[PDB]
Amino acid sequence: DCTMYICGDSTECSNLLLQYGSFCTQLKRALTGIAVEQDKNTQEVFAQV
């Protein structure tokens, strides 16, 4: 999570970060895609029967 990492529990830092556009919405979709791919990998190797 961005907010916890970059601006730890400080409202002003989060407000300042909000001006940087969609540099975190992009940083979550990649990791979720990686997680889903990891879940599918072990399924396609074994679930052949």
Partner 1 sequence: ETKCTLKSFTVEKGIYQTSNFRVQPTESIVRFPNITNLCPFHEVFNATRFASVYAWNRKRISNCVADYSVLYNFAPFFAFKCYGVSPTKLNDLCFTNVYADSFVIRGNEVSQIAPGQTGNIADYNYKLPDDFTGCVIAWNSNKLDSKVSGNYNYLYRLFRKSKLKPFERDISTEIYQAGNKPCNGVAGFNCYFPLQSYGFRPTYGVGHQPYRVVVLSFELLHAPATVCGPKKSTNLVKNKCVNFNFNGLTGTGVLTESNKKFLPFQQFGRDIADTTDAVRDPQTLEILDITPCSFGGVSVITPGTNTSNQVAVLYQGVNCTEVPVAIHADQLTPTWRVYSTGSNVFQTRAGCLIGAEYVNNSYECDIPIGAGICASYQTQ
User: By the 8 A CB rule, do 17 and 7 touch?
Assistant: yes
Residues 16 to 35: which contact partner 1 by CB under 8 A?
28, 32
User: By the 8 A CB rule, do 20 and 9 touch?
Assistant: no
* 37 touches partner 1 by CB under 8 A: no
User: By the 8 A CB rule, do 13 and 28 touch?
Assistant: no
* 36 touches a second copy by CB under 8 A: no
Q: Which one of 4, 9, 31, 39 is in contact with a second copy (CB under 8 A)?
A: 31
Residue 18 has which token pair? 């909000």
Query: Where along the sequence are the contacts to partner 1 (CB under 8 A)?
Result: 1, 3-4, 9, 28, 32, 39
